Amino acid sequence: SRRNLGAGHWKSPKGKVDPRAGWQNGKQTGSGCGPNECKGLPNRHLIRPPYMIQNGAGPTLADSTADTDLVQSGGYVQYDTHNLYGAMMSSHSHNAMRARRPDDRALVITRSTFAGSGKDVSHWLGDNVSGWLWYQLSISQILQFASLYQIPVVGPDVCGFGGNVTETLCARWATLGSFYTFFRNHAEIYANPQEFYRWPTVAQAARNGISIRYQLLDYIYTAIYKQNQTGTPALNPLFFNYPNDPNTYPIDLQFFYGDGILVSPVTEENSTSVTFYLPDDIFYEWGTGKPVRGQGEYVSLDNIDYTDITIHYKGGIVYPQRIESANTTTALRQKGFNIVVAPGLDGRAEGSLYLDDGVSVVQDTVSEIDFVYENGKLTMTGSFEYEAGVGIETITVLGVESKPEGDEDVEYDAENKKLVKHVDVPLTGENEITIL
Amino acid sequence: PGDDLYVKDLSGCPGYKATKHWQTRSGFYADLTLAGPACNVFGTDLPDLKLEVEYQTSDRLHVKILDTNNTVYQVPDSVFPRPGFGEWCSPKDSKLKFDFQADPFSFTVSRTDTGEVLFDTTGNKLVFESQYVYLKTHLPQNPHLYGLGEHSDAFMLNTTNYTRTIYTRDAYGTPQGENLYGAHPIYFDHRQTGTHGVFLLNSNGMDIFIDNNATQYLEYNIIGGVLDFYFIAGPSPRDVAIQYAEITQTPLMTPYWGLGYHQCKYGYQDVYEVAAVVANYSTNNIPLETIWTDIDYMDRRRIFTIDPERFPANLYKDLVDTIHARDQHYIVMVDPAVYYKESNPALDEGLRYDIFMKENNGSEYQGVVWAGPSHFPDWFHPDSQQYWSEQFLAFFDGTNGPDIDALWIDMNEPANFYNRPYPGNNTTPENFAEVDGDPPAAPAVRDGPDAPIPGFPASLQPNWV
Ligand SMILES: *[C@@H]1O[C@H](CO)[C@@H](O[C@@H]2O[C@H](CO)[C@@H](O[C@@H]3O[C@H](CO)[C@@H](O)[C@H](O)[C@@H]3O)[C@H](O)[C@H]2NC(C)=O)[C@H](O)[C@H]1NC(C)=O
Numbered sequence: 001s002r003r004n005l006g007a008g009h010w011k012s013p014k015g016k017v018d019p020r021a022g023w024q025n026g027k028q029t030g031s032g033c034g035p036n037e038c039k040g041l042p043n044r045h046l047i048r049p050p051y052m053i054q055n056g057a058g059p060t061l062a063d064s065t066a067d068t069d070l071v072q073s074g075g076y077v078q079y080d081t082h083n084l085y086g087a088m089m090s091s092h093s094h095n096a097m098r099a100r101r102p103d104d105r106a107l108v109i110t111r112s113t114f115a116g117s118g119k120d121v122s123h124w125l126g127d128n129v130s131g132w133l134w135y136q137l138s139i140s141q142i143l144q145f146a147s148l149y150q151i152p153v154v155g156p157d158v159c160g161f162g163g164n165v166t167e168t169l170c171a172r173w174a175t176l177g178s179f180y181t182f183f184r185n186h187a188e189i190y191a192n193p194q195e196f197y198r199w200p201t202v203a204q205a206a207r208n209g210i211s212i213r214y215q216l217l218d219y220i221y222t223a224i225y226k227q228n229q230t231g232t233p234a235l236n237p238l239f240f241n242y243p244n245d246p247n248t249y250p251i252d253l254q255f256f257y258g259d260g261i262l263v264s265p266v267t268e269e270n271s272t273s274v275t276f277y278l279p280d281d282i283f284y285e286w287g288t289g290k291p292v293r294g295q296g297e298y299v300s301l302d303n304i305d306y307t308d309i310t311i312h313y314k315g316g317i318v319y320p321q322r323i324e325s326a327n328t329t330t331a332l333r334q335k336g337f338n339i340v341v342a343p344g345l346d347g348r349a350e351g352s353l354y355l356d357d358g359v360s361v362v363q364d365t366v367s368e369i370d371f372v373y374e375n376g377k378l379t380m381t382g383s384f385e386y387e388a389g390v391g392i393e394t395i396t397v398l399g400v401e402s403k404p405e406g407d408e409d410v411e412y413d414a415e416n417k418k419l420v421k422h423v424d425v426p427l428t429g430e431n432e433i434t435i436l
Numbered sequence: 437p438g439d440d441l442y443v444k445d446l447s448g449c450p451g452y453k454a455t456k457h458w459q460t461r462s463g464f465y466a467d468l469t470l471a472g473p474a475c476n477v478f479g480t481d482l483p484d485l486k487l488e489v490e491y492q493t494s495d496r497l498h499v500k501i502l503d504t505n506n507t508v509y510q511v512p513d514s515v516f517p518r519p520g521f522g523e524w525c526s527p528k529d530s531k532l533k534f535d536f537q538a539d540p541f542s543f544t545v546s547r548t549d550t551g552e553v554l555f556d557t558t559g560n561k562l563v564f565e566s567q568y569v570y571l572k573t574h575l576p577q578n579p580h581l582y583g584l585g586e587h588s589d590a591f592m593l594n595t596t597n598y599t600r601t602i603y604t605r606d607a608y609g610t611p612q613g614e615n616l617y618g619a620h621p622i623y624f625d626h627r628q629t630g631t632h633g634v635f636l637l638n639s640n641g642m643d644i645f646i647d648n649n650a651t652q653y654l655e656y657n658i659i660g661g662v663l664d665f666y667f668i669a670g671p672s673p674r675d676v677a678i679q680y681a682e683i684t685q686t687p688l689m690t691p692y693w694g695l696g697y698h699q700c701k702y703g704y705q706d707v708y709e710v711a712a713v714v715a716n717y718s719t720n721n722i723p724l725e726t727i728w729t730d731i732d733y734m735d736r737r738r739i740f741t742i743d744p745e746r747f748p749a750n751l752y753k754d755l756v757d758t759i760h761a762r763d764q765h766y767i768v769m770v771d772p773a774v775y776y777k778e779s780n781p782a783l784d785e786g787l788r789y790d791i792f793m794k795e796n797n798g799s800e801y802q803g804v805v806w807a808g809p810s811h812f813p814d815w816f817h818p819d820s821q822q823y824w825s826e827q828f829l830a831f832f833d834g835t836n837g838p839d840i841d842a843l844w845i846d847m848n849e850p851a852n853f854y855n856r857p858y859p860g861n862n863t864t865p866e867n868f869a870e871v872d873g874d875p876p877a878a879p880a881v882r883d884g885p886d887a888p889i890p891g892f893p894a895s896l897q898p899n900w901v
């Protein structure tokens with residue numbers, strides 16, 4: 001059944017839809033175009049027009065594509081609708097995938113898109129090359145689609161399509177690849193094999209990246225759901241989080257995986273050092289959870305192993321993590337939760353967790369869970385209609401300056417200023433948990 | 437291509453002037469006419485235009501400049517359903533304010549609260565022709581612009597001598613400073629005072645040029661359609677994203693398993709290699725959610741066929757059954773090119789439904805892609821959906837082809853090797869295919885994998901059992 005029980009908490013305000021006002025254009029369509037209107041002016045040069053654009057394909061609009069003079073059903077000519085051919089095939093393919101599995105969300109990874117294609121298809125960035133440049137510019141491109149174009153599931157060919165990848169570049173791409181919303185290794189027919197198991201360094205780089213990714217899978221799944229709900233992006237440029245900090249405006253070698261996870265990969269070829277910007281905010285190292293006070297200045301780490309990537313938690317956010325990674329996402333969904341609290345400068349933290357059956361287009365039952373932490377207390381509100389068969393096993397609080405008095409169900413790592421509280425809280429209803 | 441963008445002279449073009457203008461509860465309107473003799477630099481100057489300004493919400497301002505009798509091409513409602521149905525906003529209740537000069541015709545979009553100008557064509561000619569539409573805005577010194585891809589350049593757009601060309605093309609190596617596969621005419625303008633968005637709902641080819649010759653500007657050089665703009669006020673970067681999602685519609689939700697790691701290669705020669713990759717990931721304790729196959733699965737690269745030697749139905753079923761039994765997923769590539777030189781389901785049903793793009797003489801359009809000589813479906817055809825759906829239903833059934841869990845779409849620009857260069861390298865489809873190698877010979881048929889595959893049926897390793 002399709003109750004969609006517990007949904008609708010994170011939708012944005014539905015603006016006043018005065019029905020009898022209809023279109024302001026006074027017509028029966030948003031374009032103001034009747035069914036035999038707006039087809040294009042006749043007596044046009046459709047192959048080689050008077051003003052020719054800087055087309056990389058060649059001297060005509062037809063080079064390496066379909067002739068741009070072809071008249072389609074309804075009288076539309078390829079000259080005008082060429083930029084929509086990618087989008088309209090993609091739309092037709094989505095519907096075809098729905099016909100053969102009507103109850104499931106259709107995942108479609110398409111090359112050519114147009115504005116609005118986000119509503120029915122996802123993207124991969126096409127035929128890149130096994131070079132450091134394509135690895136570098138990858139972040140500009142995922143940010144374009146996820147942050148600007150409303151196509152949140154996007155990634156390039158990890159370790160590069162064309163050419164032969166080196167151990168170091170593929171190890172590097174494996175770790176960065178783990179923070180793409182679409183994560184896929186692909187290669188050209190005359191490229192040497194570049195599966196992660198072909199090099200020990202690349203294999204361990206993958207184990208590290210995929211482990212972090214899978215711990216954060218529900219975290220990114222929630223971000224993509226919130227984007228589905230309101231259009232709030234599942235990847236964020238630094239300036240999206242720090243709009244008043246001009247240092248962040250041109251940055252495209254770091255990004256936020258969701259709202260909070262700062263991804264600062266090593267960008268320079270045959271190097272183990274990275275110079276990266278930390279905004280004026282509290283951050284916490286991944287894994288250790290060790291506080292790092294950003295000062296709105298570039299910082300330099302050295303001796304970044306080729307199997308490793310620099311990742312920080314942004315303060316002010318609650319990160320719901322699977323306690324462990326697993327070899328399948330079917331196995332992953334049976335792992336309990338580690339709710340990681342990263343206090344902001346005000347000592348507070350906010351975060352969401354979306355749970356459902358993971359497949360169905362219209363869910364029967366969903367859990368739209370909100371987490372709030374302030375004054376040593378974690379509050380869990382929202383909806384809990386989805387039987388997950390798993391609960392919260394640990395509540396990790398970062399930036400705990402000193403060990404607390406009581407030693408009941410609590411480990412304190414003094415080095416990393418990290419408290420871990422062992423608990424057994426099911427996700428069946430709202431709850432409050434005192435930590436400090 | 438040439439250098440039309442760089443050597444164009446619009447000095448002789450007269451621009452437009454507003455002959456009359458009226459206001460509504462949520463709108464501004466004006467009739468526009470040539471302010472002087474036509475220049476017709478790149479087609480015929482339209483003598484008359486319409487200006488339509490709709491305050492749709494407090495966040496979204498619609499500014500549309502079009503022809504007077506709805507003949508100029510506009511993006512079909514089918515493809516991009518328009519926002520603002522049943523919505524209207526009193527002008528003073530809008531975050532953005534629209535202002536215009538009558539003569540010469542220019543307009544400004546400003547912030548209603550601060551009076552800050554976000555978009556300004558003051559002192560810049562409007563040129564509206566059959567095959568060329570030019571509009572230029574002022575920008576602040578050292579602006580921070582994002583979008584107008586798909587591109588592989590710096591995320592924050594270059595501001596000096598920067599060409600950004602929007603026209604979908606098969607661009608191998610995703611080259612910097614060149615038009616790539618997708619077309620997204622949206623830019624974010626980020627300032628210390630706030631973020632705003634400028635969306636051009638136009639699907640024609642265009643050169644956008646951003647430069648600081650005298651002052652900073654951005655110009656649109658569009659070879660068709662109308663100036664159909666949505667301005668979105670933010671003022672937060674996320675606000676612009678959310679407001680732009682009101683126009684595009686919010687993105688579809690993704691399957692949970694899709695966020696798992698995907699492995700693909702162009703060159704996976706048979707069901708044995710696909711099996712061996714899957715088992716080698718598990719043996720080496722690297723999680724793998726989904727294994728893929730490119731064009732190699734097909735019969736001589738023909739869509740909705742299987743290689744009967746290298747991907748035989750029986751062993752293809754055993755492969756996909758074992759993938760599914762391990763709780764993993766299977767995805768394969770599909771492209772629009774339908775081989776027409778021999779009988780195949782896609783061609784046969786294609787001609788029957790009569791859904792292929794056609795030449796003036798009425799014969800189906802000919803190109804060449806990987807299968808060889810090929811036709812291209814017409815997605816505007818009212819039977820195109822049924823044709824495509826039924827192809828999928830007949831093929832991906834776990835008997836005639838693999839029961840896939842998701843789709844990969846490639847070469848949907850569409851890609852057409854035949855036009856290298858246009859037209860058809862001055863030869864026939866058959867001769868171009870032979871010389872270009874469409875299709876190439878598949879590698880020699882193997883006895884099986886080059887080593888045993890732990891966890892996979894005997895049938896997928898008959899040379900090791
Ligand atoms: C999140 O993603 C889901 C799908 O995963 C989006 O579902 C979309 O829902 C709309 C409306 O329910 C569908 O649009 C059409 O509505 C008309 C009603 O006039 C109906 O007659 C059509 O048959 C159609 O249902 C749309 O097809 C559907 N999209 C898909 C891919 O199935 C949803 O809009 C996204 N956003 C939110 C806020 O949930």
Ligand SMILES: *[C@@H]1O[C@H](CO)[C@@H](O[C@@H]2O[C@H](CO)[C@@H](O)[C@H](O)[C@H]2NC(C)=O)[C@H](O)[C@H]1NC(C)=O
Nearest residue numbers: 193195709710711712713715716719886887888
């Ligand atoms: C999967 O891994 C196995 C090793 O476990 C590879 O098998 C080797 O293949 C080479 C030739 O490519 C042979 O010379 C070796 O004798 C094989 N080793 C063993 C132990 O059998 C196999 O090639 C890999 N296959 C894939 C697709 O990655």
Ligand SMILES: OC[C@H]1O[C@H](O[C@H]2O[C@H](CO)[C@@H](O)[C@H](O)[C@H]2O)[C@H](O)[C@@H](O)[C@@H]1O
Nearest residue numbers: 207208209211212286287307308309310
């Ligand atoms: O290999 C399993 C572990 O993977 C991650 O940790 C590694 O990768 C991190 C990012 O480069 C390093 O900071 C860390 O030192 C590595 O051990 C993951 O964080 C762990 O939870 C996994 O056990």
Ligand SMILES: OC[C@H]1O[C@H](O[C@H]2O[C@H](CO)[C@@H](O)[C@H](O)[C@H]2O)[C@H](O)[C@@H](O)[C@@H]1O
Nearest residue numbers: 127188189606608702730731846847853
């Ligand atoms: O000539 C165009 C390109 O053809 C090949 O790549 C295409 O075909 C592959 C197999 O279907 C796909 O993986 C790829 O995405 C397509 O673009 C060739 O490998 C490229 O080098 C050519 O530029």
Ligand SMILES: *[C@@H]1O[C@H](CO)[C@@H](O)[C@H](O)[C@H]1NC(C)=O
Nearest residue numbers: 162163164188189190191192
């Ligand atoms: C990769 O290197 C191999 C030899 O190791 C060579 O045969 C092949 O041509 C190279 N491929 C590419 C795409 O450069």
Ligand SMILES: *[C@@H]1O[C@H](CO)[C@@H](O)[C@H](O)[C@H]1NC(C)=O
Nearest residue numbers: 482483484503504505506507
């Ligand atoms: C429509 O207007 C155009 C000029 O924009 C003109 O060339 C054409 O002949 C007109 N057609 C009709 C039916 O008025």
Ligand SMILES: *[C@@H]1O[C@H](CO)[C@@H](O)[C@H](O)[C@H]1NC(C)=O
Nearest residue numbers: 442594596597598599612613
């Ligand atoms: C503009 O930049 C291009 C390369 O991006 C360069 O070829 C050209 O010289 C530049 N134009 C001018 C007028 O300097």
Ligand SMILES: *[C@@H]1O[C@H](CO)[C@@H](O)[C@H](O)[C@H]1NC(C)=O
Nearest residue numbers: 589594597598599612613614
């Ligand atoms: C953008 O500017 C950078 C830095 O000057 C330059 O390397 C690049 O060529 C420019 N890109 C284009 C397409 O002009």
Ligand SMILES: *[C@@H]1O[C@H](CO)[C@@H](O)[C@H](O)[C@H]1NC(C)=O
Nearest residue numbers: 327328331717718724762764
């Ligand atoms: C994953 O690990 C489980 C438990 O050891 C095992 O049963 C399963 O076969 C493994 N699957 C893969 C694909 O590695």
Ligand SMILES: *[C@@H]1O[C@H](CO)[C@@H](O)[C@H](O)[C@H]1NC(C)=O
Nearest residue numbers: 795796797798799800801802
């Ligand atoms: C139809 O016209 C096209 C375009 O010139 C041409 O290539 C084709 O050979 C023609 N076919 C027939 C049957 O006249």
Ligand SMILES: *[C@@H]1O[C@H](CO)[C@@H](O)[C@H](O)[C@H]1NC(C)=O
Nearest residue numbers: 861862863867868869871872
């Ligand atoms: C294209 O045409 C030229 C002759 O003009 C020829 O040398 C070349 O081999 C042709 N290639 C194909 C693929 O048709």
Ligand SMILES: OC[C@H]1O[C@H](O)[C@H](O)[C@@H](O)[C@@H]1O
Nearest residue numbers: 100101829832833834839840
């Ligand atoms: O033919 C293939 C299809 O068969 C059935 O309709 C199943 O419901 C579906 O999961 C499968 O993909």
Ligand code: NA
Nearest residue numbers: 130160161191
């Ligand atoms: Na490669």
